[PDB]
Amino acid sequence: WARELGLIRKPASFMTSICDERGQELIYAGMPITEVFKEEMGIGGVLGLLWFQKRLPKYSCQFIEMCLMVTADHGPAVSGAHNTIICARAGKDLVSSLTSGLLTIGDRFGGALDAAAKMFSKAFDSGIIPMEFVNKMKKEGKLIMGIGHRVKSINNPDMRVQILKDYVRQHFPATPLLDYALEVEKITTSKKPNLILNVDGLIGVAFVDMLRNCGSFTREEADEYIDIGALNGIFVLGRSMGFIGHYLDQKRLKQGLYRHPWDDISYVLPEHM
Amino acid sequence: WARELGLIRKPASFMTSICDERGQELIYAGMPITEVFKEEMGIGGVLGLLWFQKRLPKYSCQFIEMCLMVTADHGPAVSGAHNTIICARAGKDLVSSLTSGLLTIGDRFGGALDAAAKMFSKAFDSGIIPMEFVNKMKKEGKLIMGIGHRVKSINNPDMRVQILKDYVRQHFPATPLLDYALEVEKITTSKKPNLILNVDGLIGVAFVDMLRNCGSFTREEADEYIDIGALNGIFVLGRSMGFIGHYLDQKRLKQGLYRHPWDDISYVLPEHM
Amino acid sequence: WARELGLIRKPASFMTSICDERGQELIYAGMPITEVFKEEMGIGGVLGLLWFQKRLPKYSCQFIEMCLMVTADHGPAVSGAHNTIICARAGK
Amino acid sequence: GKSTTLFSRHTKAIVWGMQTRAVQGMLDFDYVCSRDEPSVAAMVYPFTGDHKQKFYWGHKEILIPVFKNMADAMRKHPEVDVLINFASLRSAYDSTMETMNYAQIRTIAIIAEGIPEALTRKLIKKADQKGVTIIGPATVGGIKPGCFKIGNTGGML
């Protein structure tokens, strides 16, 4: 009561500059809810607002919608989806068995997006020629992330990295990075019959070429939002929709508990202690 | 080597009827990757395939895309998003601070979708008249889930529950539940000036009216997929994009560690032990 | 400063009847920290206090210490320990 | 070489030491006298970074910068003429001798308690030839009502 007629003070934590919820209409980063469907933008449109707080124009709204559409689930072998089958067979629920699976996105699986942007955004803005970038790395180890594929590289393309290749070719002026990305490819495709840009490699540069080529992002929200790790945000929003699809399949078929039998273990206990 | 020329056997675990990934093109539940963009369906289209394994027709593909577009963030006060600010201020990373955030969707927050479908799907298919359904509950306690709103109910709608109301009115023949949903509303709106169908309540019935009205789902995949909890899958895919939207906001402003000061605690330690 | 000389009010959430931490010594459910080692109870002794808030007598303090000592790990086959090897190999 | 009118309605001052309550205790005195601008320009504390500290001028939020070195207090804002120190006895002397080298400051007052009498008499030679009035140690402070107030003189409002 005493604060309502305004006589005391209070300091305020919890900055949270998104999604005004009290009042009569939920305002997003610049817009009420009903005004969104009058422009009728897709959920890429709210993916601009809730993440970047700029009205992103609808030639690229369909790009980031197309971007997570191709980074869906990738089969049950991968160590991301392999956990969330196990926590499905133990039969917990959905959301405590979705959250076991997003725990593996780290520095040796699935975070190859973040390495295939910060290896190229450094080596272009403070950059050097293509045939010394490759020369610098191949005197140190440290292979180029986003590049490497076991099955189909040359004269036999990936058939989905080329789906994005024309959609970034039409509605995207001013692409410095991706034309710098292809020129690191051409030297390396002569070097090995493998080593095309992977689908994680192109999105490592097709997303940063979405920022500094579109308007309303100058040079300071373009680099910091890759620095915080919003590029991981495209991934763990993307692979999250497949894990549940992995999960719902693992509960419809009504499987029992998994055990992982003893004939792979080979215990290496010492002599006596 | 010896299994390759096929002489031994092996039993097989891991049933996983989704996402064929070895071969040359990633086949989804019925379709290769490139054939998806030739029909050019949205990510609602892959949301049909990766969850329900049926080619969902593209009048309802835009419904489930619109369905998670309105179940974005609902404000930074709610106990879902309140955790993921705290693990943002402690500064872990993105995907461990999305991980603590989805762990709160349970039986007292945000799972009201699951109660606002299985209270109505029971009381319609094995159903009774509207003015004994309300009479049955109001001799037991157990208030109707999906209904209850503190601010704007009558002569003043919430302006987004009506947004879905026409989009389910045009492209949706055969709606038994939602017309049965509105008739539970009309008796109750006369009973109290509050108690409109909430946005979580309509989606609790607009989604089950998506299943048993559209084709390719007869009555046996329509009920079991609400029984497993795939309707929670709409929610924790939906609220997962607002959580990161809090997180990128809570790291750009570069805040320090939170402490929650002592003047709310009021320790109730006993006398001596 | 206004609440320090006590003129306004405030309702209080967060009941938490364990582990007084402000002051000079951390009091547990009935006892300061230093008084625990003067009786010298094991961590079963704090397992009585922090969970059940009763001074549990030290014939059974050694039971619940023995109780979790035999329910340790049970080999890497079981689906509990099988996950945490996988998220170890991914190196988080 | 001193001034005559020490304080006015256009006086600005910079405090030393993280003593934000007394900074708040100074800022509200500007509000009740309805002075046009706030008086506290910067807070000089070398053990933090360079950022902006939040306070409450009336009901709104105001952002006062915290600086790390004394020369960067001079660069963007050389119109400050009164410098204050609220540090303890263990660092009072070094915060003063480097200060009076910058001659744009015209008034210095010291609050700290426990200063040696030689360090008391070390300071007086330097301001004698330069002309800065010293209202130094074991002092609660001074008041010019309607215009300006030093320290927790008067206490709360």
Side-chain angles (χ1 to χ4, degrees), chain A residues 154-165:
Chain A
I154 293 181
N155 301 317
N156 191 9
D158 296 328
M159 217 69 41
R160 61 158 173 178
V161 75
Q162 303 197 328
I163 294 173
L164 264 295
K165 183 139 51 176

Side-chain angles (χ1 to χ4, degrees), chain A residues 63-64 67-68 70-71 110-122 124 144-147 161 164 168 176-178 180-182 197-212 222-223 225-227 230-232 234-235:
Chain A
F63 162 71
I64 212 66
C67 190
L68 55 92
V70 287
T71 43
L113 271 300
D114 189 271
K118 299 293 184 182
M119 272 309 187
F120 285 171
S121 160
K122 166 192 59 182
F124 174 66
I144 302 303
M145 290 279 193
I147 283 171
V161 75
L164 264 295
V168 69
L177 267 298
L178 189 39
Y180 176 56
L182 300 180
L197 283 180
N198 307 327
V199 63
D200 299 289
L202 180 142
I203 294 175
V205 295
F207 182 55
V208 297
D209 214 293
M210 196 277 290
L211 262 180
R212 68 180 71 191
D223 47 359
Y225 267 42
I226 314 298
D227 194 340
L231 162 71
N232 271 315
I234 305 178
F235 199 57

Side-chain angles (χ1 to χ4, degrees), chain B residues 93 95 259-260 262-270 272, chain C residues 11-17 20-22 28-31 55:
Chain B
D93 47 356
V95 310
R259 180 58 201 264
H260 198 71
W262 289 328
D263 64 335
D264 198 77
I265 300 301
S266 61
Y267 308 90
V268 203
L269 279 74
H272 192 269
Chain C
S13 316
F14 278 93
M15 303 304 190
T16 167
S17 88
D20 198 307
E21 92 277 11
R22 82 284 185 272
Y28 281 1
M31 186 159 308
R55 183 64 207 90

Side-chain angles (χ1 to χ4, degrees), chain A residues 20-57 59-79:
Chain A
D20 199 308
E21 92 277 11
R22 82 284 185 272
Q24 317 293 112
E25 293 87 3
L26 313 182
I27 310 169
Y28 281 0
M31 186 158 308
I33 172 64
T34 78
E35 196 61 73
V36 179
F37 302 114
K38 307 310 147 275
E39 319 184 23
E40 200 183 3
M41 67 207 79
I43 70 165
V46 307
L47 263 173
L49 300 190
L50 305 160
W51 285 1
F52 310 96
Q53 292 175 349
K54 302 302 216 65
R55 183 64 207 90
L56 207 46
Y59 73 99
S60 158
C61 172
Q62 282 312 117
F63 162 71
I64 212 66
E65 168 185 286
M66 203 184 195
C67 190
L68 55 92
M69 210 196 303
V70 287
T71 43
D73 40 359
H74 200 187
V78 195
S79 157

Side-chain angles (χ1 to χ4, degrees), chain B residues 1-3 5-57 59-130 133-212 214-272:
Chain B
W1 186 260
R3 209 221 196 269
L5 61 91
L7 60 85
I8 176 173
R9 210 154 277 178
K10 190 172 282 293
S13 316
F14 281 90
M15 298 298 306
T16 167
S17 88
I18 193 171
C19 187
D20 199 300
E21 57 92 21
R22 83 285 185 273
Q24 316 292 113
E25 294 86 3
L26 311 182
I27 310 168
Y28 279 4
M31 185 159 308
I33 172 64
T34 79
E35 197 61 72
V36 179
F37 301 112
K38 307 310 147 274
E39 320 184 22
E40 200 183 3
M41 67 207 79
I43 80 161
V46 308
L47 263 172
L49 299 190
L50 304 159
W51 285 0
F52 310 97
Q53 291 175 349
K54 303 302 217 65
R55 183 64 207 90
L56 207 46
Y59 74 100
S60 158
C61 172
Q62 283 311 118
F63 162 71
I64 211 65
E65 169 186 283
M66 202 184 195
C67 191
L68 57 92
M69 207 194 304
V70 302
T71 45
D73 184 78
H74 201 191
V78 192
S79 158
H82 171 239
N83 266 345
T84 187
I85 305 162
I86 295 296
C87 295
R89 301 261 287 282
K92 281 281 298 167
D93 47 356
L94 168 71
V95 310
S96 175
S97 280
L98 190 62
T99 300
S100 156
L102 280 88
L103 203 54
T104 78
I105 289 92
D107 66 323
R108 223 185 276 116
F109 150 73
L113 269 297
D114 188 271
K118 303 281 193 202
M119 271 309 188
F120 286 171
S121 161
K122 166 191 59 182
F124 175 65
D125 286 6
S126 291
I128 208 176
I129 53 170
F133 170 55
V134 182
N135 278 136
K136 180 175 72 176
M137 291 275 128
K138 286 300 285 187
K139 305 159 102 58
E140 305 159 321
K142 47 180 60 51
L143 197 41
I144 302 303
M145 290 280 193
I147 283 171
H149 188 283
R150 276 84 66 191
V151 185
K152 299 158 299 289
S153 42
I154 293 182
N155 301 317
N156 191 9
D158 217 329
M159 307 299 170
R160 59 159 174 177
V161 58
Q162 302 196 331
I163 277 178
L164 264 296
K165 184 141 50 178
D166 66 352
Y167 197 77
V168 70
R169 267 195 194 273
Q170 314 169 352
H171 311 283
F172 272 109
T175 79
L177 267 298
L178 189 39
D179 312 340
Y180 176 57
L182 300 181
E183 284 195 349
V184 184
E185 154 196 350
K186 297 309 161 59
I187 306 179
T188 46
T189 52
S190 281
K191 270 197 62 53
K192 278 303 154 50
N194 288 120
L195 282 75
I196 192 60
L197 282 180
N198 306 327
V199 64
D200 291 304
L202 183 145
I203 293 173
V205 291
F207 182 56
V208 298
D209 213 293
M210 197 278 290
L211 261 180
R212 60 172 65 144
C214 164
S216 49
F217 300 97
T218 70
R219 264 306 310 256
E220 281 70 22
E221 296 181 353
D223 47 359
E224 189 93 334
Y225 268 42
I226 313 298
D227 194 340
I228 299 301
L231 167 138
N232 269 314
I234 305 178
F235 198 57
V236 302
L237 206 71
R239 190 63 62 86
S240 160
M241 68 199 58
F243 275 6
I244 295 188
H246 283 287
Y247 171 71
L248 295 167
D249 191 16
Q250 287 306 303
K251 195 71 71 69
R252 190 183 52 197
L253 310 174
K254 261 188 183 179
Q255 309 296 132
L257 160 68
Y258 180 81
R259 180 58 201 264
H260 198 71
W262 289 328
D263 64 335
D264 198 77
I265 300 301
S266 61
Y267 308 90
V268 203
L269 279 74
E271 52 92 22
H272 192 269

